Structure 1
Amino acid sequence: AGLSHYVKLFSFYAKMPMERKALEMVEKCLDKYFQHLCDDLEVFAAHAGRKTVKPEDLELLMRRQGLVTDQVSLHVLVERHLPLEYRQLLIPCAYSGNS
């Protein structure tokens, strides 16, 4: 499903043919990626003292992953990869009604 979505997106992200036997191991890589993430969101949201995981709860985590910097903030990272109708939810546009 979604792991199959990412391995297919791996094909258009690696720009280069790979093997299916590589894909079920990258599936375990995504499973462990969540096995680190969802308890990294767990511990980071607990660090903020909030039960829920707000967007800034993940901005700090992505700062940990070195992908958010003072040059590359959270929102700019949304520009480069997410589609428009999806970043319309994340980065606040303006209508005098900023999302």
Structure 2
Amino acid sequence: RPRQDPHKAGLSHYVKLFSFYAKMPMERKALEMVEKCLDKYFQHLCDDLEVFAAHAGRKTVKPEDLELLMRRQGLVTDQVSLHVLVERHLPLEYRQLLIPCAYSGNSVFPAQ
């Protein structure tokens, strides 16, 4: 008779992925405070997205706002673009929606 908090369902995905990268046995008490770290990151992440959108004069959040954030984070540099990072870390089905490629009569999707 299981009952699961929907909020904990989302965090459980990244918590398991954490144990894959660690490559060390990890104590149970370390698990839940990583969950504590994640929600703090999400809260502060959303706050930053407000200002960058607000500065541009549009309330809607567009991808180039996310590019601007990651450049300040140091993830995106002159050599490593946004397209390069998607290729390395995301599956094929997610790649089609994000990165545009021309095919079948020079048709490009998404339009860029």
TM-score (norm 1): 0.89
- What number of residue pairs does the alignment pair up? 99
Where does structure 1 lack aligned partners over 5 or more consecutive residues?
Answer: none
Distance 1:47 1:5, change over 3 A: same
User: What RMSD in Å do the two structures reach over aligned CA positions?
Assistant: 2.0
Distance 1:97 1:30, change over 3 A: farther
The CA deviation at 1:81 is 0.8
How far apart, in 1, do the equivalents of 2:45 and 2:105 lie?
32
The CA deviation at 1:16 is 2.2
For the Cα contact (< 8 Å) 1:79–1:87, is it kept in 2? yes
The CA deviation at 1:93 is 2.0
Runs of 4 or more, structure 1, over 4 Å off, are 96-99
Larger radius of gyration: 2
TM-score (norm 2): 0.79
Distance 1:45 1:97, change over 3 A: farther
The CA deviation at 1:96 is 6.2
In terms of mean alpha carbon deviation, does 14-23 or 26-35 score higher?
14-23
The CA deviation at 1:51 is 1.1
Identity of aligned residues (%): 100
How far apart, in 1, do the equivalents of 2:105 and 2:53 lie?
27
In terms of mean alpha carbon deviation, does 11-20 or 63-72 score higher?
11-20
For the Cα contact (< 8 Å) 1:48–1:57, is it kept in 2? no
Where does structure 2 lack aligned partners over 5 or more consecutive residues?
Answer: 1-8, 108-112
The CA deviation at 1:90 is 1.2
Residue 17 in structure 1 maps to residue 25 in structure 2: yes
The CA deviation at 1:19 is 2.0
Identify the structure with the greater strand proportion: 2
How far apart, in 1, do the equivalents of 2:103 and 2:22 lie?
38
